[PDB]
Every structure is written in C-alpha cells, then in structure tokens.
Amino acid sequence: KISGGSVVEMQGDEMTRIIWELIKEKLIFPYVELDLHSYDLGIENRDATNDQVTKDAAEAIKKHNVGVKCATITPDEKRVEEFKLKQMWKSPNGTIRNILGGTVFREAIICKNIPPIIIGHHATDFVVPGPGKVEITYTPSDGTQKVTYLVHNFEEGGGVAMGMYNQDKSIEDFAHSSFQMALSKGWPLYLSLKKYDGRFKDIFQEIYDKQYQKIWYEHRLIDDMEGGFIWACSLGMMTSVLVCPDGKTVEAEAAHGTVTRHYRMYQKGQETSTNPIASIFAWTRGLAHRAKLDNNKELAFFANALEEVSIETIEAGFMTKDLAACIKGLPNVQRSDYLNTFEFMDKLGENLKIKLAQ
Amino acid sequence: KISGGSVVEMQGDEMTRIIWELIKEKLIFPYVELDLHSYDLGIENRDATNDQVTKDAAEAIKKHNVGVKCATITPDEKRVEEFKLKQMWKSPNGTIRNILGGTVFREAIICKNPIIIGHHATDFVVPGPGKVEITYTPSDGTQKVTYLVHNFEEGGGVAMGMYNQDKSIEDFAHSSFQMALSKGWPLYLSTKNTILKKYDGRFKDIFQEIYDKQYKSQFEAQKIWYEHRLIDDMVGFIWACKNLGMMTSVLVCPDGKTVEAEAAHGTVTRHYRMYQKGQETSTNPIASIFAWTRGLAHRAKLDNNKELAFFANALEEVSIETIEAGFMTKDLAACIKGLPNVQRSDYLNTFEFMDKLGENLKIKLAQ
Numbered sequence: 001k002i003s004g005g006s007v008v009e010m011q012g013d014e015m016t017r018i019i020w021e022l023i024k025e026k027l028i029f030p031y032v033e034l035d036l037h038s039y040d041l042g043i044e045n046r047d048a049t050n051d052q053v054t055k056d057a058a059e060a061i062k063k064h065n066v067g068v069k070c071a072t073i074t075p076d077e078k079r080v081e082e083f084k085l086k087q088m089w090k091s092p093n094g095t096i097r098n099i100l101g102g103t104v105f106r107e108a109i110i111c112k113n114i115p116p117i118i119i120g121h122h123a124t125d126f127v128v129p130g131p132g133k134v135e136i137t138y139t140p141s142d143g144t145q146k147v148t149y150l151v152h153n154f155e156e157g158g159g160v161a162m163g164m165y166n167q168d169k170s171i172e173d174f175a176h177s178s179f180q181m182a183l184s185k186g187w188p189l190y191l192s193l194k195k196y197d198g199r200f201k202d203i204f205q206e207i208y209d210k211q212y213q214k215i216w217y218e219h220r221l222i223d224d225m226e227g228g229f230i231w232a233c234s235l236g237m238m239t240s241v242l243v244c245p246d247g248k249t250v251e252a253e254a255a256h257g258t259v260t261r262h263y264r265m266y267q268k269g270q271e272t273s274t275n276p277i278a279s280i281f282a283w284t285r286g287l288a289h290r291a292k293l294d295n296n297k298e299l300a301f302f303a304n305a306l307e308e309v310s311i312e313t314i315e316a317g318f319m320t321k322d323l324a325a326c327i328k329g330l331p332n333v334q335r336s337d338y339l340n341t342f343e344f345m346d347k348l349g350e351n352l353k354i355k356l357a358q
Numbered sequence: 359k360i361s362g363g364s365v366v367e368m369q370g371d372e373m374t375r376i377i378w379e380l381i382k383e384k385l386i387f388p389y390v391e392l393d394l395h396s397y398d399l400g401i402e403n404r405d406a407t408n409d410q411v412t413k414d415a416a417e418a419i420k421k422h423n424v425g426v427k428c429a430t431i432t433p434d435e436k437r438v439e440e441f442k443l444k445q446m447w448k449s450p451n452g453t454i455r456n457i458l459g460g461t462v463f464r465e466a467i468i469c470k471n472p473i474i475i476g477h478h479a480t481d482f483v484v485p486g487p488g489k490v491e492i493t494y495t496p497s498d499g500t501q502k503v504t505y506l507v508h509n510f511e512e513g514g515g516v517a518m519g520m521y522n523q524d525k526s527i528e529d530f531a532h533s534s535f536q537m538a539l540s541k542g543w544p545l546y547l548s549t550k551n552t553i554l555k556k557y558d559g560r561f562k563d564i565f566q567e568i569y570d571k572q573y574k575s576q577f578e579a580q581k582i583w584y585e586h587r588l589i590d591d592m593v594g595f596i597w598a599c600k601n602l603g604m605m606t607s608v609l610v611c612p613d614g615k616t617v618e619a620e621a622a623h624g625t626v627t628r629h630y631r632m633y634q635k636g637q638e639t640s641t642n643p644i645a646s647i648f649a650w651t652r653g654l655a656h657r658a659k660l661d662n663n664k665e666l667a668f669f670a671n672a673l674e675e676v677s678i679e680t681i682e683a684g685f686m687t688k689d690l691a692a693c694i695k696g697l698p699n700v701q702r703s704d705y706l707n708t709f710e711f712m713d714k715l716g717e718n719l720k721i722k723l724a725q
C-alpha cells in the first residue's frame with residue numbers, strides 16, 4: 001500500500017454518502033494508507049453539534065491543505081421539518097469558502113462517447129422611497145479629492161439603488177489562482193462597464209508580464225468564445241475545486257447535489273444508477289494535490305490511474321443510466337445498456353485492480 | 359386575400375434585406391392585404407435622412423401598434439468607413455426602444471429534430487485608500503442618508519453605483535404579465551432576492567402587487583400561474599430574468615396593446631458578401647418569418663381577425679414542419695449531422711428553401 005498522508009475528508013448526506021463510502025472502501029483504502037482527518041457533515045450530526053463540525057472541518061483544511069467533500073443537504077423549511085432541525089443552518093459550502101477564500105473551478109469530465117473547458121467564477125443595496133439625488137462619492141485618506149458622481153436624479157418617483165466595490169488584493173488572487181491553475185494543467189488561460197470589468201484586464205496583464213512552456217494567456221469579450229483551456233469569468237460528470245490564494249490549499253468536490261430523488265428509491269429498496277464519477281474525481285483531484293505538495297511519485301501515479309480507469313470504463317461501454325440516456329435518449333434505454341450504482345462501482349474496482357496490476 | 363390592416367414594416371440591411379423581400383414576395387403578399395406603413399431602415403436611407411426615418415418608424419409603431427423589423431446594420435468606426443456615413447449612428451432598435459419603452463422577449467423555435475426569456479451604470483476606479491459611500495438626498499428637504507459602500511484601507515480597486523426607477527420595474531412587470539396571457543404560458547420571475555434583500559426585494563414585491571391587483575383573476579381564467587423563484591431553484595413557460603436563425607425577439611410594451619417583432623440574429627454579413635460575390639448561400643429565414651407571424655398574430659388578436667389569426671398559425675406550422683420533414687438550411691443541417699459531416703444533399707440554399715416553404719403553404723392552405 002501507499003503513503004497518502006494528511007487528508008481532510010467530509011462525509012455528506014443521502015445518496016452521495018452511500019457512494020462516498022463505497023469509493024473509499026473499494027477504490028481508495030484498498031490501495032492507499034492515509035492520515036485521515038474525518039469530519040461528519042451529515043445533516044443530523046451538523047445539527048447535533050450546532051454546525052460546529054463544519055467549522056472545525058474548515059479549520060482542518062486551512063491546516064492540512066487538502067480537502068475532499070461529499071455532497072451535503074442545505075436546509076430549507078421542508079428539511080428543517082424533515083430532520084426536525086433546530087435551525088436553518090447555513091450551507092456548509094458557504095461556511096467553508098468563507099473560511100478559506102480563493103476561487104472555484106468547474107470541469108466537465110469528458111468521456112469521448114457522450115454527446116475540456118475549466119471555468120473559474122470570481123455590495124450595499126437600498127430603497128429610494130421617492131425623488132431625490134443619489135450620488136456615489138469617494139474620499140481619499142489624504143483627502144486630496146472628493147470625486148462624487150451623480151448615480152441618478154429621481155423625479156419620476158422613487159425606486160431602488162446600490163453600491164458595488166472590489167478590492168485589488170481580491171482581483172490579484174483571482175489572477176494568481178487563475179494563472180497557477182493554468183500551469184498545473186498546461187492549458188491556455190483566457191479572461192472575458194468601462195472602468196470595472198476594465199481594471200481586471202489590467203491587473204491580469206500586470207501579473208502575467210511579471211510572474212508568468214508553449215502556452216498563452218489572453219483576453220476576450222464573452223461572445224468570441226476545440227476545447228482544453230482555463231477560463232476566468234450529465235451532472236455527475238461535473239467537478240468543482242476550490243483553489244485558495246496560497247496555491248497550496250485545495251478542496252475538491254462533486255459539482256452536483258445529494259441526489260435526493262435517487263436516495264429516496266434506495267430507501268424503498270429499488271435499484272438505482274447513480275453516477276459516481278464526479279465524486280471519484282473529487283478524490284483524485286485532491287489526492288494528486290496531496291502528491292504535488294509532498295512530491296509523492298507512487299500516489300501521484302495512482303490518482304491519475306484512477307482518473308484513467310473511470311473514463312476507460314465508460315468508454316469500453318460500461319456506464320450508469322444518466323449516461324445511457326445521453327447516448328440512447330431517455331425513452332429508449334434498455335436495462336442492459338447500463339449498470340446500477342453497485343455494479344458500476346464493481347466494474348471500476350475490477351478494472352482498477354487490473355490496471356494497477358500492470 | 360385576407361385583409362390584415364395597419365402594419366408598420368421596416369426593411370433592413372444586407373442578407374436579411376434579401377430574405378425579407380422574398381418573405382413578402384412568396385409567403386405574405388400572395389395571401390394577405392395590408393395597409394402597409396413601410397420605412398426603409400437600410401443603412402443608406404437612414405444616413406441620407408439623418409436617421410429621421412428611424413424616428414418616424416418609431417412614432418408609427420407607437421401609433422398603429424404593430425411593428426415588424428428586418429435586421430439592420432449598427433455602425434461602428436469600421437462600417438462608417440465602408441459606407442462613408444456622415445456619423446456613427448445609434449442603433450435603430452436603441453432609438454426605437456427608447457420611444458416605445460417596454461421589455462424584449464427571445465424565443466427559441468422547437469423542431470422535434472418551449473421557453474421564452476425576458477431580461478430587463480456608474481463605474482469608476484479607486485486609486486488608493488480612502489472611503490467609498492453612496493448618498494440619497496431626498497428632493498423634499500428631509501435628512502440626507504449615507505451608506506458605507508466600503509473603506510479601502512490597503513490598496514484601491516474600483517466601485518460603482520446602480521439604480522432603477524419604480525416605473526421601469528412596473529413596466530417590466532406588465533409586459534411580462536401581458537406576455538404570459540398572450541401566450542397562455544405561466545410566468546416565473548428570478549431574482550437574487552436573498553443577497554440583494556433591499557434591491558431585488560423590490561422587483562419581487564412589485565410583481566406580486568401587480569399580479570394580485572391586476573392579473574390574478576385572468577391567470578386562473580386560463581389555468582396558469584405566476585410565481586417567484588430564486589435563480590438556482592429555477593435551473594412551456596415565460597421566464598423573467600433580472601439581468602440562431604431559430605430565435606425571435608419581441609419588444610412588448612406594458613399597455614400590452616403595442617408590440618414589435620424581429621429576428622434575433624443580425625444582418626448575416628458573411629453570407630451576404632458570399633452573395634454579392636455571386637456564390638450560393640443557405641441563410642435561415644425561419645426567425646424572420648417568425649417576426650411576421652407574431653406581428654400578424656398580434657394584429658389579429660387586436661382586431662378580432664379570426665381569418666388572419668389562422669393564417670399566422672398556419673404559416674408557423676408550415677415552417678416548423680418543412681424542417682421537421684428533412685427539408686432545411688445548412689445551419690440546421692449542421693445542427694443534426696455535425697458541421698464536418700454536412701453534405702450538399704443534406705441542405706437547401708436560401709432561395710430553394712423559400713420555394714419549399716412556398717409550395718407547402720399553398721398545400722397547407724388549400725386544406
């Protein structure tokens with residue numbers, strides 16, 4: 001077995017929980033020995049501990065640099081009363097991002113036989129009750145100006161208004177996170193309201209021509225946009241990763257939800273077919289990041305190995321039903337066109353056993 | 359020949375100009391008689407008249423309530439060079455939009471081989487540290503109100519105001535409620551109401567206030583409903599967002615009487631250079647055709663015109679079912695068979711297609 005080392009992991013809810021556990025027992029643990037800081041973000045436990053788990057889990061990732069996360073129920077009223085929760089807790093993902101900062105990137109994992117671009121997403125509002133001047137003013141600390149622009153003069157009636165700002169530091173991190181990400185995967189980096197959308201283009205350049213292999217960075221406007229590039233701005237084939245400012249701390253995740261609908265059938269004892277891909281990839285993305293930070297060769301090969309098998313397995317035909325519908329189209333899918341959740345998992349572990357054997 | 363009545367029409371530019379003329383020659387004029395208020399919004403005539411025609415065309419739609427626009431060139435520094443324009447004129451739609459007001463509505467066109475979507479600035483650079491604020495002095499001498507946007511203590515950055523008048527939202531509301539009745543589809547508004555509690559909280563309210571005092575009766579009188587939702591709970595209906603030869607844009611006014619319709623794409627300059635040069639092309643008319651069929655549809659609703667009303671639907675089918683039957687333009691061919699695998703014998707070119715559409719409208723109509 002391999003020496004994986006420090007890894008913060010968070011168990012989640014419902015159908016993804018069940019899948020998460022399988023991923024571990026059938027793909028991870030049979031191959032890798034990890035220093036595993038486990039946190040249970042399952043809904044009943046978060047409620048029990050007053051979302052405290054979540055806070056510590058977050059401190060843990062800050063502290064160990066690697067985080068993989070299972071999907072977690074976010075509470076609304078139906079849920080507050082379904083689990084008889086003592087509060088409408090906030091989204092765990094909300095909590096974690098706050099504590100960590102940095103920027104999220106989503107990637108569709110591309111299986112050649114189904115019908116890659118990596119996209120990286122990145123105020124005071126009030127009501128005007130009636131006519132009057134609304135003016136957005138700026139006051140240096142050495143008060144040598146007093147730019148104050150008129151936003152609008154209301155005469156019609158009242159209305160609504162707001163003031164959005166953005167700090168340089170925060171723009172820099174974006175570009176940092178962006179450029180770094182763009183190196184790590186060796187893909188062209190692109191980035192897409194005069195002076196605002198503006199100063200962005202600026203700082204990127206200033207940081208490109210100062211800190212950053214046959215690869216380029218550029219600029220565009222939305223519409224102009226083969227594949228295979230980073231870009232600042234099925235579901236079970238989507239993978240979200242939070243890259244922090246420091247470029248050391250990473251937290252990976254499936255970009256879908258807890259798949260309640262599927263889980264509900266599971267509870268009825270009905271066969272399911274849930275796409276483990278997005279979840280598996282979150283693991284590998286973090287495990288390869290574990291590797292990079294440690295210079296662990298064996299593991300670094302393993303994470304890749306696992307990412308490989310998962311495509312090859314779908315490519316050799318064997319796949320889950322959501323994927324079966326992309327090919328066949330929902331209405332005309334035979335059972336014999338896909339595997340259920342457990343059979344799929346069985347097939348991976350099998351192909352993985354074998355791929356790792358050579 | 360069905361009499362249609364008062365119709366404002368605006369001829370446009372380049373490729374779309376050509377298609378427009380065919381659309382009238384082969385599919386409209388042979389079946390419908392119209393009191394036509396034409397205006398030529400070609401770049402030439404617009405220039406030669408100091409964009410007066412555009413302004414006239416506007417005031418005329420305001421008047422007769424039904425405008426159908428052919429796509430028109432908006433000039434940029436480059437276009438000006440080419441045409442020797444005496445100014446870089448503002449977009450027609452921009453000027454048209456302002457005179458009539460209202461909200462635009464795009465509609466993708468479904469062939470088995472529907473969702474309508476309606477959408478709706480003071481930036482400046484913070485050099486270094488200091489304070490960014492926004493004020494509201496009320497015009498009635500009451501106490502001036504100050505909000506902190508943010509204190510920049512390290513570097514600078516950037517900041518910006520945004521605003522909106524009540525009146526504008528109300529208009530946004532009406533147009534959408536009118537739009538929902540017109541279509542027989544239920545309506546949804548999407549906001550960032552949790553984040554912009556005070557801002558979007560205003561849209562949501564106004565939609566509700568207007569829904570209940572004005573439209574709740576009529577919606578149920580059609581077995582449909584309006585509802586609010588947040589942007590992620592969102593992802594046969596009308597969707598109000600607070601923010602190709604198969605795409606139809608429609609300006610709807612709040613009075614719900616006036617309406618104006620046009621193809622969403624542009625003037626298709628590429629095909630047109632290819633056309634000037636004399637090579638065959640395969641431009642998609644459908645979107646343009648559809649401007650006519652909403653325009654007519656609307657007039658037919660306004661004027662209690664059962665015979666014209668039927669014509670419109672009749673045509674709308676024909677276009678759909680000509681594609682749905684394997685007869686199509688390259689862009690749609692390519693949609694099915696993949697750009698690299700499209701062959702000549704998979705599509706028909708601009709003229710040939712119009713013919714088929716022509717031939718079929720006859721048949722459909724003879725029944």
Ligand SMILES: NC(=O)C1=CN([C@@H]2O[C@H](COP(=O)(O)OP(=O)(O)OC[C@H]3O[C@@H](n4cnc5c(N)ncnc54)[C@H](OP(=O)(O)O)[C@@H]3O)[C@@H](O)[C@H]2O)C=CC1
Binds near residue numbers: 071235256257259273
């Ligand atoms: N913490 C997190 O990571 C997130 C959690 N959530 C939470 O999840 C809960 C319920 O999830 P919900 O949004 O309803 O559904 P999901 O977001 O999990 O996905 C909805 C539908 O997409 C399809 N789908 C998604 N993922 C998969 C997969 N891995 N394999 C197969 N099919 C898939 C299924 O389609 P079909 O209906 O056809 O089966 C599913 O019902 C909510 O309480 C919400 O708070 C939501 C987003 C992110």
Ligand SMILES: NC(=O)C1=CN([C@@H]2O[C@H](COP(=O)(O)OP(=O)(O)OC[C@H]3O[C@@H](n4cnc5c(N)ncnc54)[C@H](OP(=O)(O)O)[C@@H]3O)[C@@H](O)[C@H]2O)C=CC1
Binds near residue numbers: 428623
């Ligand atoms: N009046 C109006 O409402 C509008 C006017 N315009 C004006 O038009 C001018 C030029 O337009 P431009 O943006 O170059 O071109 P378009 O925006 O019309 O179209 C962009 C490209 O998409 C494809 N395409 C669009 N419509 C069709 C169709 N019906 N059938 C087949 N293919 C289509 C063509 O590319 P391909 O070669 O890939 O087939 C075309 O080159 C601009 O100066 C602009 O001001 C633009 C938008 C709206």
Ligand SMILES: Cc1cc(Cc2ccccc2)n(O)c(=O)c1
Binds near residue numbers: 432449451455
């Ligand atoms: C310049 C301009 C263009 C359009 C049409 C348009 C063209 C391309 C993308 C979107 C919309 N409209 O409507 C305007 O008001 C102004």
